[PDB]
Design an enzyme around this catalytic site. Structure first.
Site, short mmCIF file in Angstrom:
data_model
loop_
_atom_site.label_atom_id
_atom_site.label_comp_id
_atom_site.label_asym_id
_atom_site.label_seq_id
_atom_site.Cartn_x
_atom_site.Cartn_y
_atom_site.Cartn_z
N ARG D 85 1.20 -1.06 0.36
CA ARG D 85 -0.18 0.12 -0.09
C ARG D 85 1.12 1.17 -0.60
NH1 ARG D 85 -4.32 2.73 0.29
NH2 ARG D 85 -5.49 4.15 1.64
N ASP D 145 -20.44 10.83 3.70
CA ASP D 145 -20.70 10.30 4.99
C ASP D 145 -21.90 11.29 5.90
OD1 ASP D 145 -19.26 8.58 4.00
OD2 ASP D 145 -17.23 8.54 5.29
N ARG D 148 -24.82 11.45 4.59
CA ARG D 148 -25.64 10.04 4.79
C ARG D 148 -26.43 9.74 5.86
NH1 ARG D 148 -25.10 6.98 1.74
NH2 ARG D 148 -26.13 5.01 0.69
N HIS D 172 -11.71 9.82 6.42
CA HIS D 172 -12.22 9.20 5.04
C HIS D 172 -11.94 7.88 4.91
CE1 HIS D 172 -14.39 8.67 0.62
NE2 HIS D 172 -15.49 8.86 1.81
#
Ligand SMILES: NC(=O)c1ccc[n+]([C@@H]2O[C@H](COP(=O)([O-])OP(=O)(O)OC[C@H]3O[C@@H](n4cnc5c(N)ncnc54)[C@H](O)[C@@H]3O)[C@@H](O)[C@H]2O)c1
Ligand SMILES: NC(=O)c1ccc[n+]([C@@H]2O[C@H](COP(=O)([O-])OP(=O)(O)OC[C@H]3O[C@@H](n4cnc5c(N)ncnc54)[C@H](O)[C@@H]3O)[C@@H](O)[C@H]2O)c1
Lengths: 308, 304, 304, 308
Positions: D85, D145, D148, D172
């Site tokens: 990553r 988010d 939501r 996030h």
């Protein structure tokens, strides 16, 4: 962008209200001889803003008109019981001789939108006084009647107004002309298209009256019209603000129209950031040409009688 | 859908123009005993339609109000005896309306809203939530707009209320006003735009005295209430369930019983659906109560 | 109201995103045998909703399409045998849909629309007007946009059509194109922006080859058809009765019988409600007919 | 006004599509390494324009970004099967080291909107490379988010989302924090208000998952997310364009947050023409403060590991 409105009466205030509710401009300035009138209207409208769009509507002076892209002229006087029509007309012309120079002083590049009735006459007066090229002085003209004419044709044909192409030309009044001959639906000739998928003289007469007598009916039971012209002006202002180049039947000083010279009347015009930008002459029938010629004469006459 | 308006004066017609310009409903019906006036109005507005939204605005009789999901009561004038006269008009209207549209929500606009909403309720025989007065919506909105302008933050982020009687008894709820969940006054200081007592006084007169300024140099107010009224109509048509400081019959408030005044309320398809009591300071609770009795007594006098 | 979408690929989902962004309907249902895909899609779009309009977008089975006033058929791929395969998919879908929403208008999007619309019709057992293919709407709109740009006039004032088969058999109707009721070419000369044969060729490739350019460097087209499809849905939901160059089963056209292609048509709550035959020149009538037989034969081959 | 978008992939193109359908800007320019990709997207979108608003969407080069008020950064590479990553992150950082200088070259005053995931990390990288003040580099962060979270609370309370005040802060991603404690409805405390006119741990957990795992669910059955961020970015762009000064939970370089120093994460920020203009710290409970501290550490760590 900011828009000016000199003349904060019913027409001026209604236009400001429409501009706000539709969010056509970020700033709207009302200018009036009656300073408190303009302030009360701006504040009333400002109380509507939280429920529509963030538009800054305020009262101001000619100086506060600086930077305006367009300025609506809805200033005028009310006829005195007993005076002649040419006396009233002359008095409005005096109002314009005070306003036009003041407006162009503070906003030299603004397009002038004339709304004061009789609009075609006042449009000519606004042009002569401005010292601008013809295209920058625009009168609302017959936009409302043209739109009602299409709506009526569409209601009858059971089709959408956007598909109907029809024009009401000439004087914004009793001598206006409904261009029935070249009216179209989906590019196809109206009369023809209707006779199949028609339009009897009784149907045309009923439509003619629904268009031509609307203002009369409204003045008759209300005293004046403003809501309709408020949105119509709002639309004309959006067209100038966005440089749309859309075709509208608006009043503008026309070099020659069907024989008469230097007169202002409604014709299909391309409207953009600099005012009218070109005329679109549709096909006219002998009768229509004649009515348009007739209507033009009437206005040319008023023009002469007034000194314009 | 379909909305109705009884009283084709400036307010009633301004409301219709707002309803049409914003495209709130499909059908708008104007009703006034002066038939020609409602028609003139409906026609002036129908001239605007091609330049906004496809709204069918027209004049009609109470009967034409059939199937309306909301009806705006803006009849009357604008002084105790006047109330009685306006009250008799409502005795005449309320029945005729519920007769043609039994299920419509009533939106009282006639001043004074608080008292007139009280009258409408008792006269309707409907449950307390189906009769809604415009109340203080314009003032609350103006309160948040001024704070927003002053703080330099967007109005949607400002949460402040104007409660009670729509008038000079208005209670600006400074105590619990917020900005993004932060107390107003500390948010203001944090932003570098502290709200001095003089700043707040300036804002108070800005909210409380607007109507007075508008009448003084114009004669009447209608543009603002037209849009606010149309917004309420939208909440009812879309069953929005949003929160508005509107007037409605309240069982008890700060001490007084059975009275109508403005409080934060959830507005939906069936009208006011719930109340949201905000935090009030000792002073604010006083005013709201004094203001509550002012209305209570006036209501009693009229026999309501 | 409520609209349905069968086929949750790029086109079907783009359509839903358009339906949601423009606030066309109250409810949007995505249906695809790949349940997780329709749900992923419906959820991606539901994340956008708070920033546009209150639209309830969700995934579902054919059953969830109950009460939908319109259903978008965007299933399949994008070459005669392919047609047969897509045809079998429709044999599977058309029934299942009319089963749950017997009264919905069918909006064929799957390519090739003309032929697929033909298939959908015969498979539906509904009247010719209730099965509408997107046809040439994007091309007509692109045709008017290019002329508008060139002439320097607003698109709403330009009236031009692209007829026939959605593809290379497209017929740009120059002969009767207009601008404010004036013939295009003379309006153009009058404005000082005369349309040379080279200018028109440039515009032709601009309209006719767009799809090819979009596939070449992107792989597929979906943004444009998503919005056009949503516009059609709006005309059906608001019973607009407006005029669109959409594909539909046509009894006869320039010589050929029972075939589906694009022509100006009035679109309302029940689908195509009428046809507006424009004036075509000798050449244009040829192409439209040759193009008509091209589709007719292909249709016959598939047994439709 | 014109808006730029460097990175014409699914996120970049979806944002352009939203901008157009919503009419947020008059001009939108897509810039991508793959010139044909950007041209095909602009043209596809252009075919949608006649059905919404007159927005000029076109592909161009960094030079064509001149005058842009805001520029969306949605450029990035896809992870190679097998690499670490931090290897992927480093590769995106290389992409940004090429893009940021190019963008500020052609549009020195543009506000930078970072969209490339992980947004908080990329937001820090964008800031360090830009040489601008903190407020001009803004990451979409948790706006989706947070929205939501309000929608879910509103659906549960049977009230409108506009009345619900709730925030999702921090990274996030998986370590984001739902601020349940100071969440409000109509200015009143959520939990309190619900317990009368409530919220069990099972109700909060079900909501937490509806918010926190949405991206995961979408990636799982679609491969990537874009429609949601497209509109969210569209909204952030409108806020900058109109100088709204609205409060959004967006990512920006934060001097200090709950102890950690110089890290980029989402906090309620005032957004306008010049970028973020001030932070609005809501009341946090010990648990929440801790989660926010935890989330901040995670990002600070990635930051160090990457050289930012
Ligand atoms: N709308 C109609 O039905 C109708 C009918 C007949 C005449 N008109 C004409 O159209 C105009 C607008 O109509 P309205 O209803 O809004 O009118 P109105 O009478 O309500 O308002 C006219 C406005 O222009 C203002 N004004 C006059 N002279 C001015 C000056 N020198 N500088 C700045 N402001 C000045 C007035 O103070 C007033 O605010 C009227 O003046 C009138 O002359 C309109
Ligand atoms: N949306 C998601 O679910 C998600 C998931 C994981 C990672 N991301 C990251 O977010 C970014 C955007 O996602 P997307 O779906 O739109 O991605 P995408 O892979 O479809 O497109 C990435 C775009 O950036 C471009 N690009 C790469 N380097 C560039 C450079 N130096 N200059 C100009 N353009 C360049 C590509 O050519 C491409 O058009 C991705 O690169 C990725 O690194 C997104």
């Amino acid at each position: 962008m900011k828009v000016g409105i000199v003349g904060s009466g019913m027409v001026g205030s209604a236009t400001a209200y429409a501009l706000a509710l539709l969010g056509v401009a970020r700033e709207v300035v009302l200018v009036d001889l009656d300073r408190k009138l303009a302030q009360a209207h701006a504040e009333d409208i400002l109380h509507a803003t939280p429920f529509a769009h963030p538009v800054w509507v305020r009262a101001g002076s000619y100086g506060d008109l600086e930077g305006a892209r367009a300025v609506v002229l809805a200033a005028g006087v009310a006829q005195r019981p007993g005076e002649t029509r040419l006396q009233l007309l002359d008095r409005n012309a005096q109002v314009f001789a005070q306003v036009v120079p003041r407006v162009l002083e503070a906003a030299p590049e603004a397009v002038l939108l004339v709304a004061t009735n009789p609009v075609d006459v006042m449009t000519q007066v606004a042009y002569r006084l401005s010292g601008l090229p013809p295209g920058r002085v625009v009168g609302s003209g017959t936009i409302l009647d043209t739109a009602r004419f299409r709506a009526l044709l569409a209601e009858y044909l059971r089709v959408a107004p956007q598909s109907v192409h029809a024009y009401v030309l000439g004087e914004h009044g009793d001598s206006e002309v409904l261009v029935w001959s070249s009216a179209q639906v989906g590019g196809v000739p109206l009369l023809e298209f209707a006779e199949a998928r028609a339009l009897s003289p009784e149907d045309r007469a009923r439509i003619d009256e629904g268009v031509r007598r609307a203002a009369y009916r409204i003045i008759e039971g209300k005293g004046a019209t403003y809501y309709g012209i408020g949105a119509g002006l709002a639309r004309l202002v959006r067209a100038i603000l966005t440089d749309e180049k859309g075709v509208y039947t608006v009043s503008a000083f026309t070099p020659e129209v069907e024989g008469v010279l230097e007169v202002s009347l409604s014709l299909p015009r391309i409207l953009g950031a600099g005012g009218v930008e070109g005329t679109v002459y549709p096909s006219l029938s002998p009768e229509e040409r004649e009515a348009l010629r007739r209507s033009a004469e009437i206005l040319k006459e008023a023009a002469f009688a007034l000194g314009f």
